[PDB]
Amino acid sequence: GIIIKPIISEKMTAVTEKMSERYGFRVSPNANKIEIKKAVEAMYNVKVEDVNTMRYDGKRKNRYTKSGLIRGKEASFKKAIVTLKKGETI
Amino acid sequence: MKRTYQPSNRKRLNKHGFRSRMATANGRRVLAARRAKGRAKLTVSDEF
Amino acid sequence: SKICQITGKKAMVGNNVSHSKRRTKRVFDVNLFRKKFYWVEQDCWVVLRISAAGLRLINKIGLDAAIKRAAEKGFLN
């Protein structure tokens, strides 16, 4: 299960209202395009055309305790914009 | 005025990195001493 | 690791002592050299790094017996 969660955002909504065969997933950072493609085919029973990926490092954050301050980090992830064949949706 | 510290990541890792420390016996001595003191950072390879 | 292969002799640590009894560290070195020997039993030639005392032992009891004794004593390797 390399797919973590779908991307619900204004940019994804705009690109899906434009193209309607495009869907954005957030996946594990070490999964390459071929396995992302096979995984979405397994999880949704669709034929996939092309995959675009970009790596995000975690945001640095400031955890606040009673006394002072601690420096922490969010987890890294990989974005996967997925183009289905013309005719199918998710 | 040029100051003493002129950063270069390749030079930093070549001079003080984990593999360069592990290469010699005295570098392993330094690593053992830092582990015995209990340092959270062991080499310059730890920082990011 | 320059050690006589027959006797096991190695360099000793001692003192240079002057007339005013000043003492300075020094090394007594082994009279060591490489020599080629004819091994009769195997009919071969063997190069040994030996001392003059080892050469004396070889000339006393034969090269084959000296080699066997050194091997049993662990000097030869």
């Binding site: - | - | 004819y38 009769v40 050469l55 070889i58 000339n59 009891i61 034969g62 017996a65």
Partner: protein
Amino acid sequence: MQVILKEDVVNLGYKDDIVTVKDGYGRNFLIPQGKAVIASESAKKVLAENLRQRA
């Protein structure tokens, strides 16, 4: 150096006998060149036995 003589040797006779020589003359010349062999106790016993079998 105590040597059993194996072949004939000029200026030092006594073939098949016991002789004393300088260590270099015999470690560097005779034993390398086949004639003569160091007179260990075993070789002395064998030489004495060969002499008694000849006689």
